[PDB]
From a paper:
The first structure, a complex of clade A/E [name] [name] [name] with [name] and Fabs from 17b and [name], was solved to a resolution of 3.54 Å ([name]-[name]-17b-[name] complex), allowing a detailed description of partial closure of the open [name]-bound [name] state that results from [name] binding. The gp120 subunits of partially open and fully open [name]-bound Envs aligned with low root-mean-square deviation (RMSD) values in all regions except for the N- and C-terminal strands (β4 and β26), where the RMSDs increased to beyond 4 Å. The β4 and β26 strands in the partially open [name]-bound Envs were most similar in orientation to closed Envs, with closer agreement to an [name]-bound closed [name] structure than a closed [name] solved in the absence of [name]. A subset of the gp120 side-chain rearrangements (Tyr435gp120, Trp427gp120, Trp112gp120, Leu111gp120, and Trp69gp120) were observed in the 17b-bound partially open structure and monomeric gp120 structures, demonstrating that (1) gp120 side-chain rearrangements occur both in [name] and in B41 Envs upon binding to [name], (2) [name] binding and partial [name] closure does not reverse these rearrangements, and (3) the rearrangements are related to 4-stranded bridging-sheet formation.
Fusion is accomplished by [name]-1 Envelope ([name]), a trimeric glycoprotein containing three copies of the receptor-binding gp120 subunit and three copies of the membrane-anchored gp41 subunit (West et al., 2014). We present two cryo-EM [name]-bound [name] [name] structures in complex with [name]-induced (CD4i) coreceptor-mimicking antibodies and with [name], a broadly neutralizing antibody (bNAb) that recognizes the gp120-gp41 interface (Scharf et al., 2014, Scharf et al., 2015, Scheid et al., 2011). [name] Fab was added to rigidify the gp120-gp41 interface and induce partial closure of fully open, [name]-bound [name] (Scharf et al., 2015, Wang et al., 2016a), allowing investigation of the partially open [name] conformation.
Numbering used by the authors:
A (entry chain E): 33 to 127
B (entry chain R): 1 to 131
C (entry chain E): 189 to 300, 323 to 397, 412 to 461, 463 to 501
D (entry chain A), E (entry chain B), F (entry chain C): 516 to 545, 564 to 651
G (entry chain S): 1 to 107
H (entry chain I): 1 to 97
The structure:
Amino acid sequence: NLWVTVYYGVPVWKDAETTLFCASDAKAYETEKHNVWATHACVPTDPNPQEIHLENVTEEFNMWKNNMVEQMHTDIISLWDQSLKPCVKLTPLCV
Amino acid sequence: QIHLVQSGTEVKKPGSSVTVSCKAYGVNTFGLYAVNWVRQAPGQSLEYIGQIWRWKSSASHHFRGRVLISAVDLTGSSPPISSLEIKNLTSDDTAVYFCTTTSTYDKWSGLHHDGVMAFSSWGQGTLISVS
Amino acid sequence: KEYRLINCNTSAITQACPKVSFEPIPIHYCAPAGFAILKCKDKKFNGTGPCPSVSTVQCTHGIKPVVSTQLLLNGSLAEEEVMIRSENITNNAKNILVQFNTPVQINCTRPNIGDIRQAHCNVSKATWNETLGKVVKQLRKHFGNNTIIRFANSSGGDLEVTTHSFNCGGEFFYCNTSGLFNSTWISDSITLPCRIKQIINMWQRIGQAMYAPPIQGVIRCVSNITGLILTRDGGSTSTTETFRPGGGDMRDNWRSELYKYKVVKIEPLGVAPTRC
Amino acid sequence: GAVFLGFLGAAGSTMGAASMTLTVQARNLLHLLKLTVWGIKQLQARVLAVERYLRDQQLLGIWGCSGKLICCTNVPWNSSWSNRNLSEIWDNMTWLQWDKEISNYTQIIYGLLEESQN
Amino acid sequence: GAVFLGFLGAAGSTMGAASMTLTVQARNLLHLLKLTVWGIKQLQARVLAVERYLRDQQLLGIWGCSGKLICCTNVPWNSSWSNRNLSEIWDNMTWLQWDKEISNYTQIIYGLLEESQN
Amino acid sequence: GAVFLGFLGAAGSTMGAASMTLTVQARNLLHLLKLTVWGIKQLQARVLAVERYLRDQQLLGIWGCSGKLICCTNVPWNSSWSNRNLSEIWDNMTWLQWDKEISNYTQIIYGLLEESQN
Amino acid sequence: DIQMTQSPSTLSASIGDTVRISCRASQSITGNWVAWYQQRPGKAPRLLIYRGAALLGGVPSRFSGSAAGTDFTLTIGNLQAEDFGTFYCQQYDTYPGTFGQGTKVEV
Amino acid sequence: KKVVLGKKGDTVELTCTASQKKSIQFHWKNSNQIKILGNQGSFLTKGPSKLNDRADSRRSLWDQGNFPLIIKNLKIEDSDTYICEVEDQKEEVQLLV
Ligand SMILES: *[C@@H]1O[C@H](CO)[C@@H](O[C@@H]2O[C@H](CO)[C@@H](O[C@@H]3O[C@H](CO[C@H]4O[C@H](CO[C@H]5O[C@H](CO)[C@@H](O)[C@H](O)[C@@H]5O[C@H]5O[C@H](CO)[C@@H](O)[C@H](O)[C@@H]5O)[C@@H](O)[C@H](O[C@H]5O[C@H](CO)[C@@H](O)[C@H](O)[C@@H]5O)[C@@H]4O)[C@@H](O)[C@H](O[C@H]4O[C@H](CO)[C@@H](O)[C@H](O)[C@@H]4O[C@H]4O[C@H](CO)[C@@H](O)[C@H](O)[C@@H]4O[C@H]4O[C@H](CO)[C@@H](O)[C@H](O)[C@@H]4O)[C@@H]3O)[C@H](O)[C@H]2NC(C)=O)[C@H](O)[C@H]1NC(C)=O
Ligand SMILES: *[C@@H]1O[C@H](CO)[C@@H](O[C@@H]2O[C@H](CO)[C@@H](O[C@@H]3O[C@H](CO)[C@@H](O)[C@H](O[C@H]4O[C@H](CO)[C@@H](O)[C@H](O)[C@@H]4O[C@H]4O[C@H](CO)[C@@H](O)[C@H](O)[C@@H]4O)[C@@H]3O)[C@H](O)[C@H]2NC(C)=O)[C@H](O)[C@H]1NC(C)=O
Ligand SMILES: *[C@@H]1O[C@H](CO)[C@@H](O[C@@H]2O[C@H](CO)[C@@H](O[C@@H]3O[C@H](CO[C@H]4O[C@H](CO)[C@@H](O)[C@H](O)[C@@H]4O)[C@@H](O)[C@H](O[C@H]4O[C@H](CO)[C@@H](O)[C@H](O)[C@@H]4O)[C@@H]3O)[C@H](O)[C@H]2NC(C)=O)[C@H](O)[C@H]1NC(C)=O
Ligand SMILES: *[C@@H]1O[C@H](CO)[C@@H](O[C@@H]2O[C@H](CO)[C@@H](O)[C@H](O)[C@H]2NC(C)=O)[C@H](O)[C@H]1NC(C)=O
Ligand SMILES: *[C@@H]1O[C@H](CO)[C@@H](O[C@@H]2O[C@H](CO)[C@@H](O)[C@H](O)[C@H]2NC(C)=O)[C@H](O)[C@H]1NC(C)=O
Ligand SMILES: *[C@@H]1O[C@H](CO)[C@@H](O)[C@H](O)[C@H]1NC(C)=O
Ligand SMILES: *[C@@H]1O[C@H](CO)[C@@H](O)[C@H](O)[C@H]1NC(C)=O
Ligand SMILES: *[C@@H]1O[C@H](CO)[C@@H](O)[C@H](O)[C@H]1NC(C)=O
Ligand SMILES: *[C@@H]1O[C@H](CO)[C@@H](O)[C@H](O)[C@H]1NC(C)=O
Ligand SMILES: *[C@@H]1O[C@H](CO)[C@@H](O)[C@H](O)[C@H]1NC(C)=O
Ligand SMILES: *[C@@H]1O[C@H](CO)[C@@H](O)[C@H](O)[C@H]1NC(C)=O
């Protein structure tokens, strides 16, 4: 009668909390510290983004429980630790 | 930590209206959650009434035209309030009422099936008698 | 160990301080192969709730790593109205993010005796008043018919949260936003005294840093105030409400530009009946 | 390997319209030292996309459906898996509702599709 | 991905000899800073060849003929497409003459081969 | 392309246990100048593994068995190739013993599998 | 809607006794869309088990559930004194949801 | 709940405690929901109260999860229930002068 039909290309999501890479297009000839960082730690752009507008879907977003904020926060911790090197740090240990 | 709180015990006259409050402590918003109003006649089993999932008020087919279910979000100095209004009371609506809330955030949860929901968190009971 | 007088050796590192340049470029956070980033195209979107106009992109828009307190500089703009976002209104401890629809331009200049620890910032008055009028309209839409009495000064505490701290040209400006927030609301230009301070509190972690003495000449900081960060005052038994500015938690800067997005995993494999 | 986004345009619509959009949107969508690092990172993107595609084709290779966009197998439905008139399947449901509904039967179907190559 | 030239040795000969040569020539044909740039450019050649091969297999994946060097489908000829005795096809013609002759029917055949997977 | 080792765990056991282990172990096993040289050498490992896998799938592409982990062809055994009761084949022998035993018939079987696509 | 039938209508058991309560749908629920609630008297009914056998977070793991298309089986192992209340089975398959009848477990 | 007593003038210490060692955001409030302290990232914010000048916290202990409150110059108007809000553990102590 009727039986299993394996497809491929099915529009089904999940959620993820994964690695997620920077960035835009830096100069790679300058001494601006964001350009030096974005050179040595990120990839260039792609001039053809693919914004697929969806049909009658309804996702429920939650801005305050987003795993994207912590990841760019860690990236900017790296940017500010590599660019603005202080004269003297005072950071505690409390072992 | 939902600590959903309702109003107190009330008694009315037949052929009248009534309103039951439902303050939702610990609820983010009613965009994420969904409120299902349910009731229980004394001794009977639990009878569904209605819902406001995704800000779409809807009642079951037994209760159409008689029941209004409204909601105001967490604004300012008051938690999110749902409210149950019943018009044209009979003497057969004497019952313990409940507002319930369940989370509709995750699609692959299993607590909800396209707006038909299991009732994951409950009120405490609003008894209405009719004389 | 052991046990309340835990050994807090405040270590210190000395490194070289070359005076560096500093101007943040936009950053596009892409998702790898196999993932996708959703996007809310609803112009009046809270931050929570259902968004019906979901689109799908591979990589985000241009996000500037701009670090500031009490004002969101060089950010993005809301499409229709001044939006007000919070994790929990009535908590009185969560930073109310207020996003503007029009940029209020600010000019922080260090001129050229020449008193190297001194600069000033100009905000266009009656462009600022219109912006606070729209903000108070949206706040009354949240709260009712209260008197916003007043937008107060900062309540105190640390130096970097009391003042509009930011970076410009590698120099750290700590302004004074006391004159910019003073108005009760029943239902020319402003000069902000902005020093340059150099024993800073790190925002990266808990610490303090010391920087080089300031630079030779004119420092120009043409910017856009496209945001606010406010808090409230709890109590009491209506009354009027008071919105002292705050900030300092830098993730509140990134819940203003990673606001529209969400990361999903694409699982393309499904099974079904047939009529084979 | 950038056609993973083009799958998602048919979400929200029902299963038959998505099955047509499969074929349609598949046919239509087909020396400084600081620069060699960009070249290597773009190649590590592209080769990773190719390897993820080949792994997805190898998982269809077990079931006798490698390369086929749509295949019709030989594993009969025990009808306790969505005992439903399939007009209602292909007209009243979307794919997210299937991934929710037969989620407790999918490892069983995968085991049967593996075991029916022997 | 250097076997694209080995296809062309059977041009000029007729279609049956080329069909034999398909199987035969398929079985038989299978730290200075200025040097890393050569390594990256040779990898950008090789990965591009692999991606072009995978795209050519995905276009055979729609029609149920991915991986097969020769497949025999289920789309019957409307005989207004080269109404010709097929002895004359496989003996008197070359492939260039087919790409010239049925050029106005080929989008129709591709549409039918796409539609006969549904 | 690191699943070539997972094939070998079923050596020593007989042919049926290895045929089950095929499906099981297939489903389960799925800016300094001196650093760009490491990146290029790791990419030259990975792209070479992908090309060796695609060549191995193209050699299955001649025989109509590309992508299939197990396929059942249409070339009948002349029974002078291991004239043996196949209970003894699938129970008393390992694969090394087959590569030893039918070694003088394997080019014949490959020629027949090529010729039975025409 | 789709009427449920809870069985038995009343039982009683002792402390440490495995109790099996069945719930039978008039249709077949392939998709396990059945919840299970416990109501102590004078309180609100808390949720015990959703999707047939998925156990809620703040629930002791003594319970277990099973689903067989039409028969839904709730199994209590090492029954305690706190677990003496009217149970309910819910079908949340099709709109509107309707509940069971009540298996008043006593001693 | 906890109860901590003081007499006058001297310092007094109240504590939150998280169980993650992560320096997460906390707030110290009173019974009338007036703020007393607030973590903001790795910065300190006081509140518009009578303890605006007299409250303090040890900053270096935040990386070890411990979130103290140190009040100096204990007057008679500083006897009220003080509340940790850390994630959900709304801890309540009561100060006595
Ligand atoms: C983020 O931004 C978001 C926007 O981008 C924002 O989302 C918006 O949130 C606000 C809240 O903040 C939402 O506004 C509320 O919406 C509630 C839901 O309203 C829907 O449903 C009702 C009811 O409809 C039923 O009945 C009508 C009858 O005419 C039928 O036509 C309907 O089909 C439906 O009937 C079905 O269901 C019945 C059972 O209910 C069955 O019986 C029946 O058979 C049917 O099956 C509709 O009226 C609403 O439509 C109205 O609004 C839409 C546009 O929003 C218009 O197009 C439309 O013309 C109508 O005007 C809608 O469909 C509302 O209930 C709620 O209303 C309350 O507040 C408003 C003022 O805001 C009052 O005027 C109103 O009277 C209600 O207040 C009552 O209740 C509150 C407490 O709940 C009391 O405090 C107050 O005193 C008052 O009580 C009085 O009346 C009570 C009963 O009404 C009675 O019990 C009391 O005793 C007393 O008398 C309000 O409008 C808004 O919809 C969201 N919008 C969107 C787009 O999302 C989000 O919040 C932001 N998030 C954050 C975190 O900030
Ligand atoms: C919001 O965004 C806007 C842009 O959209 C940002 O505005 C930019 O701000 C930067 C820095 O504030 C500014 O860059 C300067 O431009 C000047 C005009 O071209 C330059 O003269 C200046 O360069 C001098 O200083 C650099 C740093 O040391 C040196 O490397 C450089 O050689 C120049 O230095 C000369 O003069 C100094 C004087 O002290 C002397 O020390 C040196 O030896 C040398 O003689 C900077 O490049 C941009 O031009 C601004 N863009 C606009 C449009 O205004 C704004 O900062 C953002 N807001 C925030 C908070 O980031
Ligand atoms: C957003 O921020 C607001 C703060 O403004 C939070 O609102 C508070 O939420 C907590 C729970 O999270 C509420 O506390 C609960 O109050 C319940 C009812 O008491 C209220 O109503 C009675 C009767 O009118 C009043 O007398 C009383 O003063 C309160 O107004 C209590 O029943 C709850 O206690 C129960 O649980 C506790 C748990 O510790 C037990 O100890 C008790 O025995 C009992 O079982 C609880 O106390 C609090 O009232 C809310 N306050 C305000 C001002 O709204 C939101 O929770 C927060 N939302 C999010 C998502 O974070
Ligand atoms: C920021 O400016 C304000 C307003 O100029 C300062 O607040 C007080 O202002 C009055 C005049 O309005 C002066 O008489 C006081 O001396 C000012 N200081 C105090 C402590 O009351 C404010 O001090 C300035 N900010 C800083 C950090 O100094
Ligand atoms: C139906 O499927 C759901 C989801 O797979 C199962 O729910 C999980 O059950 C386990 C315990 O067995 C819990 O730890 C999870 O938290 C549950 N939920 C989710 C969302 O994963 C449920 O067990 C299955 N029911 C049946 C009858 O098979
Ligand atoms: C800032 O404002 C003061 C007073 O209006 C004015 O004198 C000064 O020129 C302004 N500076 C700039 C850069 O506009
Ligand atoms: C800010 O500076 C720019 C350029 O100097 C000028 O065009 C603009 O009018 C200034 N705005 C204010 C408010 O001073
Ligand atoms: C700001 O403008 C509003 C009207 O737009 C006016 O009522 C108010 O008095 C002005 N405020 C000041 C401080 O001038
Ligand atoms: C804030 O402003 C008020 C009134 O101008 C002033 O008394 C107070 O000292 C200022 N405080 C701070 C911390 O800026
Ligand atoms: C607010 O402070 C400003 C000075 O920054 C002053 O001119 C104004 O009068 C103050 N308004 C009130 C209501 O105190
Ligand atoms: C300020 O905002 C305007 C809005 O169009 C924008 O054009 C301008 O570039 C912004 N200034 C910056 C980013 O310095």
